[PDB]
Design a binder for this molecule. Structure first.
Ligand SMILES: Nc1ncnc2c1ncn2[C@@H]1O[C@H](CO)[C@@H](O)[C@H]1O
Ligand SMILES: [Cl-]
Ligand SMILES: [Cl-]
Length: 240
């Protein structure tokens, strides 16, 4: 069988995504979000296993889709969502490590901007420094939703690396010196794409591991932190 492909990576028909989309790296987590938090839900994509779904959260249209791991992968999916699917707001709902001595496993981090070791943003701004910056209304909606839910949060910079298995001496010490709160792999690729399209993006992540102390969240602890983060993100969509 053959379906028309609106993009090379997505079989959803134009219009099948809501204007607001949550994205997480793991397509199986996108399915869990749809199954446990969306109503009126339909699967709209499964190309390359990258499951995506559209429904409603408290009556408001909302989609959720996986983005895979790394800047190049999220860039494909987000470019398509903003361009072909006419999405207006994407919130990445992720996991991360931390080096910050005052950030702990299970903490919820709301990202204001993200550094990177990728070249993708230099390529957009004539080789210069282009800060991957979250939209202020999105950051504010996340912060205010967490406050109303009485869930503490850390607010600050992320660092999006191309290399999960770092061999780079001095990186963690510099990240700590400048109070980067989250180490992940995608957000610095998302924010400039939103800018290109005049659209909005943000990111919220839970700390799975402390890169310095080697503390690590158990499976049960990751489920609880996920439940906190996803409720914050879902409630924030109602303000966006
Ligand atoms: N310690 C970490 N370093 C890099 N990426 C991380 C880390 N913890 C979680 N992630 C996120 O999960 C995936 C890597 O396991 C990526 O999609 C990334 O954004
Ligand atoms: Cl392809
Ligand atoms: Cl999960």
């Amino acid at each position: 069988h053959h379906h028309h492909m609106a993009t090379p990576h997505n079989s959803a028909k134009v219009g099948d995504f809501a204007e607001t989309v949550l994205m997480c790296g793991d397509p199986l987590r996108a399915k869990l979000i749809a199954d446990n938090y969306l109503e009126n839900a339909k699967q709209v994509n499964s190309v390359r296993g990258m499951l995506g779904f559209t429904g409603t959260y408290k009556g408001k249209p909302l989609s959720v889709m996986g983005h895979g791991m790394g800047i190049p992968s999220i860039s494909i999916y987000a470019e398509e969502l903003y361009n072909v699917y006419k999405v207006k707001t994407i919130i990445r709902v992720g996991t991360c490590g931390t080096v910050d001595p005052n950030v702990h496993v299970r903490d919820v981090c709301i990202v204001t901007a993200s550094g990177t070791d990728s070249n993708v943003n230099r390529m957009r701004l004539l080789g210069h420094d282009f800060p991957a910056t979250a939209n202020f209304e999105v950051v504010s909606a996340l912060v205010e939703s967490a406050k109303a839910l009485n869930i503490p949060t850390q607010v600050g910079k992320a660092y999006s690396t191309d290399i999960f298995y770092s061999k780079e001496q001095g990186l963690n010490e510099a990240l700590a010196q400048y109070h980067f709160i989250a180490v992940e792999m995608e957000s610095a690729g998302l924010f400039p794409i939103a800018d290109y399209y005049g659209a909005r993006a943000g990111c919220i992540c839970t700390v799975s591991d402390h890169i310095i102390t080697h503390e690590s969240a158990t499976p049960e602890e990751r489920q609880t932190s996920f439940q906190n983060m996803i409720k914050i993100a879902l409630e924030a969509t109602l303000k966006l």
